[PDB]
Amino acid sequence: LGFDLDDSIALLRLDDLYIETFEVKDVKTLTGDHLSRAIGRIAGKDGKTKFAIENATRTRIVLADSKIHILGGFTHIRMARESVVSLILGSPPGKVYGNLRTVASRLK
């Protein structure tokens, strides 16, 4: 499906990590120019916002051209999914950085 093989081994061991999947097309209907804005906004620059969500919410994501996948534990899936859907609705990355600081404080 698209995660790396060490991530899939991390799904194999420690069996309580599940794998959610959703689409860009469900929210705001995202015509193709805005879709390019959406995936560029989620990936950031050199993968940095995606790696920020990865290291923050203790989960790991991958994203195809219109369909993304998050694997991890279930409430971390939900935290990453609400941060991703806020960012794909379109928010300042500084604001989502502060929100992920608060969610990492919930994690600790």
């Binding site: 599940y18 999947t21 689409e23 469900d26 279930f74 899936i77």
Partner: protein
Amino acid sequence: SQVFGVARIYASFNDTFVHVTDLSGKETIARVTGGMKVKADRDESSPYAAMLAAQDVAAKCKEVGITAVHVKIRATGGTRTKTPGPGGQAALRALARSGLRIGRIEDVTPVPSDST
């Protein structure tokens, strides 16, 4: 000699359904949900809730007599997520563990051809 039911595992939002039927589709056996096991109303879509729900379905279906289950995962369909959430894999792992032979995992989630 084995006999076959059909899972019809519904990985909905805010809920999860599992009810095995004999492979026509009429005579359903042991409808459970995610709500009727946990007591919180917050995680009636819990993977744990679907896990013990599928365990209870496996017990009741082994009581009736069906041994294998053709499994069919359905998401909520429509103009919505179109793709199974975590509860589908949770119920799948549970009733694949719980002594029940599994056959022909599929995906029967409806596709819209661009409805509203």
